[PDB]
Design a protein around this ligand. Structure first.
Ligand SMILES: [Mg+2]
Ligand SMILES: [Mg+2]
Ligand SMILES: [Mg+2]
Ligand SMILES: [Mg+2]
Ligand SMILES: [Mg+2]
Lengths: 134, 260, 205
RNA sequence: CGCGACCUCAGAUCAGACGUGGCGACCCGCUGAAUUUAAGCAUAUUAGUCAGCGGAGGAAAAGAAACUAACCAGGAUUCCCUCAGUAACGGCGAGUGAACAGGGAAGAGCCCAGCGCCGAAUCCCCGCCCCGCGGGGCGCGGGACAUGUGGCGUACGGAAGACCCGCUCCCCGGCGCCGCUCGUGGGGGGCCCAAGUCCUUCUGAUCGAGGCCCAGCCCGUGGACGGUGUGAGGCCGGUAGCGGCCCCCGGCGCGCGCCCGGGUCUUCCCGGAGUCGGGUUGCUUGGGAAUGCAGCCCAAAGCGGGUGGUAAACUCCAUCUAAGGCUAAAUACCGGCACGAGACCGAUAGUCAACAAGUACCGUAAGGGAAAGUUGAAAAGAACUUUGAAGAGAGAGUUCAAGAGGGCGUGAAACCGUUAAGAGGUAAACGGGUGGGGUCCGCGCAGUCCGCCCGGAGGAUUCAACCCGGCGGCGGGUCCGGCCGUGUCGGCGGCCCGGCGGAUCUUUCCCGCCCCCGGGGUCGGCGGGGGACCGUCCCCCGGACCGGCGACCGGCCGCCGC
RNA sequence: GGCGACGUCGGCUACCCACCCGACCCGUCUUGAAACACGGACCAAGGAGUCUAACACGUGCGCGAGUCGGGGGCUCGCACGAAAGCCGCCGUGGCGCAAUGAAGGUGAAGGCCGGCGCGCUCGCCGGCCGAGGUGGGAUCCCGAGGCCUCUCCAGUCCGCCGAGGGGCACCACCGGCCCGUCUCGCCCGCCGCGCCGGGGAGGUGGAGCACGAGCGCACGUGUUAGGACCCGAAAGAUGGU
RNA sequence: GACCUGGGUAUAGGGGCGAAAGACUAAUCGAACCAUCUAGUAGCUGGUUCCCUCCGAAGUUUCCCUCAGGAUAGCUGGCG
RNA sequence: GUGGAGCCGCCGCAGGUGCAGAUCUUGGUGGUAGUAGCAAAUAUUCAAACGAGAACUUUGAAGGCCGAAGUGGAGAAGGG
């Protein structure tokens, strides 16, 4: 239950933040949870998706066990594209059909100088909360 | 609509050309050329007696009636019929003033909450609250109140030591302090007899805080508990007593229907 | 438009009043605003008292109310002199001073002075460092509390007489009667004419 | 006749600063109508308000009495509650209409001219360096102000000066910081629990079902939003004196600058002028033989002057010191930046404007001023083939669905087209009445009664009766335990280790005092504390009566399953 | 008791048609409408007795000679909390308990017994009480007398009870009492003997008394003032192009 | 010819201007237009949205700058 | 039968709560009706081309009209 006065509860405004977001907020709302095998290795729950994180699609029309890497992340439409899932036009041309990334599981991440540091702090800021049980 | 609805400047035609004498807008040009101006009748117009912000919203009830109703709601949770038939499943529960010890107010983790209400056979009410996870009838869904939810019991306490931290997550349940009560919480929606779980330190303070008829209460401090208008309220035991039926006439049960 | 038996009415609505209306939809929201203006002022200053300084003892000035006693404004300025405290240390001791006030009776003088010499007796001050120029020991072993409420020395304490039980004596049950009020009115409004006929007595020579 | 001050005045694209416009909801000053009311209408009402004009602020204005009071005297302003719809005003009509008390929010008081004293002890500026930031100070020398009066002490509650007595020697700014900060000052970014597990439905799940003796999991985290439909657990987030960071926020402590107060007696000083008042005229106010304010004229006084609500004279009493000034708080806010919420409105509503709305458009101009939201989950927006110059069709295809086809959700009524059925000389439609026909509906089709009991006919199982065992329940009963009501009291039991209450009591009880001559007389008490009595509530034993919805014990009758 | 299927039996809807009888078109003003009186081509949606204050009365609830916290204050830094809870040496205050008068002012109890000063229509004293009386007045109480398988022996009872008593609310009257004036009249009291107070008996004026009934809240109705049930002018005024 | 005509300028609402008709002043004139006060007042016309059940009238008195209206009684209903 | 995501009963509470009319307001559509109308200033005709398609376009040949105060050649103002 919300107790803070300084944060909303309405439908009229949360949608209005949701469609009129900036872009740096927009990657934060486009995350996908980590897989079961990988949420023990890093013990962290969710990551902001990027261009190389390979993924199987679990809930939707194309369900499960189809590990394929992402190719393009429409932030404007809150939608990723994966180079395995496709749909042909009427022309016979192929185009990528798009899916909303909370219905998507990362099987393997990408690492750089940034993702070693983000996965530090996102894992660090969990077991501090475990130390409150004294 | 406070006063403005009249920011459209217009006048009546003033002659019997062939239209009604309603005010018509000025100018030319756009589609709002000679249309209907203000008046309750017209499109884009003012409303009949536009409501005021000083309608008498807030209401007074003098406090001898505010206290008469809070006595008559706590004295309706005592009877099992007035608290089952409100809708609370108190079938399997033990004794209707459920009273637990003062050690319950040390609870600061809600796993200790759920095993409390299960062991008192009172969890079978919260399980009924989960049936009321609907969504609102009508148009409340865009005035941001959505999930209709039946109230469950209340827990009535004093000297909060953590009990509000343990029960405020359980859906559909309430707490209220036994010094600062609420007729809104005790008798929700007019129908009397909300189910309640008490505490030793709360079930004892009411004798100081409302009293008995033998003395005045020492916390409302100038109060006396209401006086019962009837002596014996079980009139089946009254009218089957031989002091009454010594003086009755008779029954008279012949119908004497209409004779042709 | 007037009908059967009723009340003649003068409502003051002919003047346009729909602009000068003042709704009190914030009279809760000001009470929760001016408790914060006290709670962040009760702890903000000091263990100096809240609810202001020590206020005087003052009797109400009309025929209607001269039987009761009111908290006033300030010690008049000879109570500071009788109790022997300087007039411009009195408001930083924490006593409120009203400069323009008269006193013309000892029956209401001494109830301030008895209060004022008792206040400083029930007072402790703090040193800068405990050199203590005119202060004793540690103030009551850290003063037992911090702050009072709604008046330091309970400014009303309206006190009354007893006169427990008496015996009717002779005179007392005879004299002090209705005719002890009539001629008090019949003389004090005829005091001037009867002396005017006592001016005429001389010129008869 | 020249020269030199000083006074008046000018000049400068001189050196250095200011002001002008914007907004206007709130605030301050002016000016200021008419509709309306009075059933007409002039006074009055509308209202000293809308319009007009000028000013600033985050609030402003107001303000430390030329006050209210008329008694046991209150004591800045502002705001709220009453006083009050009262006193009063008014063709005494309609109507308008305060304040003082009283209760609360808030509470903060002061300076200057003058009078008199201090050898102008004062300020500005220019330049150099003391020496430091993001800059100014107290040095020093120049120049100007200024004696027509700068600075100190002073302000009407008095103040100075001369004593004399006993005290005491300070504060404040900056500087660097540590130690804090009540929601733990404020902002900013970045993170913090738990199911996609089995089956099932679907275009798609967030559906329905399920989870061992812990009730599958997390709960200080079941607000909310998006996700292919209804989500505590899929993701942002919510909860939390949760976390880690980055900057800024008030209050220890060395170097500076400032730096004798109080009481008593004695002398001395003591106040704002074309203003107050008075006359006359207008405006206004509840102010009524003039409340306020202004014009014009006559114009003050020192035991004076102002006020004390009926004009004038006398007398007495009260209260304040006007014609100079400053001031936070409580308070008003429909413009502004941000916000949060709504027993609201849901696209002809809500503001005029949910969209490229003060836009399209009109008017020479002041100005007037709309219409217009929705495909789907996804554009997957109809490739390809045929006909026609193209519009548009036919196939094919996409989609669960084009019966969603680029103003595309749902798609009404008027209305029109077409198919069918019907009938058609007094225009049609209508009410009452049956008859004909058609659609569909049931019973269902000379095939429908349904249960109860009994007697025959064959068929297959086992009570019941009693008796044992059995746990439970109903109704009585010595109420023996426990019980509770009401009156009788007692143990005063806890009163001096009881509850609340009492204008019941006590001048041999205990403090601060007056009355009377270093003391006392209770000599009358007063401000105050106990302890005595009642009035009601707490145990004991003792009494009554019902063992009552206040429940159990055993024993009895008569039920009940297994 | 009788009659009968694979197309029959019953049954109607906002169904069509045919027939008989009846039938002028609806809202409105009006004594009078079908009117040769006015508005109405059709259909969808919008579209008109509201709110605030004040009062009056009826009803409902709480308390009741009192009632009312509406304004402040208290509770932790709580979403639902702009809620709810409490204050009482927070009752200040409202309205009511006390009316009359222009105003100074004054401000509501008689009864029964006995004894008396010319018991003199005037009057003085103690006592018991205590809201006066008359006529109606639901109800309640006494109730002569009656009423049961045989006559004499008695019990709680019941029912019909003639008459009589106490008498609620109220209605009419008579009396009393408080205040304002008026006629007549004599007496008393002394913070000090006066163009001083107090009283009496008659007759009137009063929104009075005669054992009080009000306050708060909610609802309905009605009336007023507010744009006031919606719509409507010729105007008028300020300020501008 | 007291003639006709282009542009510049002047005069603005109780005011401009007029060889005079109350003409003309942006199709508007016996007082222009735009905005507000203002939703101005109306004893006057027009309208005033669901069903059943019960009761169910009035046009007269007196007075009014009253005669198209209101007050008062009459008549009606609801509550007792 | 369509429709594709929300809705209703019951006890109470609160209303911007119910339409045939107001020369109502906005919007829509008929009947009239394939009717009235496409009539001021004389006037067109033949062949060819481009073209899916010609009374209306272009090109020719002829017939004409405005007729130098123009139905011509050029500007101001305005139009942008
Ligand atoms: Mg709906
Ligand atoms: Mg629309
Ligand atoms: Mg159709
Ligand atoms: Mg008709
Ligand atoms: Mg005008």
């Amino acid at each position: 239950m919300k107790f803070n006065p300084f944060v909303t509860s309405d439908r009229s405004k949360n949608r209005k933040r949701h469609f009129n977001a900036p872009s740096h907020i927009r990657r934060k709302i486009m995350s996908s949870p980590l897989s079961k095998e990988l949420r023990q290795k890093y013990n962290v729950r969710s990551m902001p998706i990027r261009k190389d994180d390979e993924v199987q699609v679990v809930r939707g029309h194309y369900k499960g066990q189809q590990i394929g890497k992402v190719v393009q992340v429409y932030r404007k439409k809150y939608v990723i594209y994966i180079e395995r899932v496709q749909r042909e036009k009427a022309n016979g041309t192929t185009v990528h059909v798009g899916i909303h990334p909370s219905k998507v599981v990362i099987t393997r991440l990408k690492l750089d100088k940034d993702r070693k540091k983000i996965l530090e702090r996102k894992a660090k800021s969990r077991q501090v909360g475990k130390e409150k049980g004294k | 609509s406070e006063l403005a609805g009249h920011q459209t400047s217009a006048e009546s035609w003033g002659t019997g050309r062939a239209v009604a004498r309603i005010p018509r807008v000025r100018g030319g040009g756009t589609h709002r050329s000679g249309q209907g101006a203000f008046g309750n009748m017209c499109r884009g117009g003012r409303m009949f007696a536009p409501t005021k912000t000083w309608r008498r919203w807030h209401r007074r009830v003098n406090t001898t009636q505010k206290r008469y109703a809070i006595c008559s709601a706590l004295a309706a949770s005592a009877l099992p019929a007035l608290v089952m038939s409100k809708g609370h499943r108190i079938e399997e529960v033990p004794e209707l003033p459920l009273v637990v010890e003062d050690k319950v107010e040390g609870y600061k983790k809600t796993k200790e909450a759920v095993l409390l209400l299960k062991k008192l056979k009172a969890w079978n009410d919260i399980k009924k609250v989960y049936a009321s996870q609907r969504m609102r009838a009508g148009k409340g869904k865009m005035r941001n109140r959505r999930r209709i939810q039946r109230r469950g019991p209340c827990i009535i306490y004093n000297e909060d030591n953590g009990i509000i931290k343990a029960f405020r997550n359980i859906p559909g349940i309430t707490l209220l302090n036994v010094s600062k009560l609420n007729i809104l919480k005790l008798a929700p929606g007019g129908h009397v007899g909300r189910f309640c779980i008490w505490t030793e330190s709360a079930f004892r303070k009411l004798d100081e805080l409302y009293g008995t008829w033998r003395k005045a209460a020492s916390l409302k401090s100038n109060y006396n508990l209401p006086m019962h208008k009837m002596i014996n309220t079980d009139l089946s035991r009254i009218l089957k007593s031989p002091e009454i039926q010594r003086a009755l006439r008779a029954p008279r049960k012949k119908i004497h229907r209409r004779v042709l | 438009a007037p009908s059967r038996n009723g009340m003649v009415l003068k409502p003051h609505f002919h003047k346009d009043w729909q602009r000068r209306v003042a709704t009190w939809f914030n009279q809760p929201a000001r009470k929760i605003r001016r408790r914060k203006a006290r709670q962040a002022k009760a702890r903000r200053i000091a263990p100096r008292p809240a609810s202001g300084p020590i206020r005087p003892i003052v009797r109400c000035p009309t025929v209607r109310y001269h039987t009761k006693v009111r908290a006033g404004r300030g010690f008049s300025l000879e109570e500071l002199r009788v109790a022997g405290i300087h007039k411009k240390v009195a408001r930083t001791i924490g006593i409120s001073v009203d400069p323009r006030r008269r006193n013309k009776s000892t029956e209401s003088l001494q109830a301030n002075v008895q209060r004022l010499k008792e206040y400083r007796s029930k007072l402790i001050l703090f040193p800068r460092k405990p050199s203590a120029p005119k202060k004793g020991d540690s103030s009551a072993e850290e003063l037992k509390l911090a702050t009072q409420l709604t008046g330091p020395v309970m400014p009303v304490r309206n006190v009354y007489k007893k006169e427990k039980a008496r015996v009717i004596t002779e005179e007392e049950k005879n004299f002090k009667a209705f005719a002890s009020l009539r001629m008090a009115r019949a003389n004090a409004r005829l005091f001037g004419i009867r002396a005017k006929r006592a001016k005429e007595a001389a010129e008869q020579d």
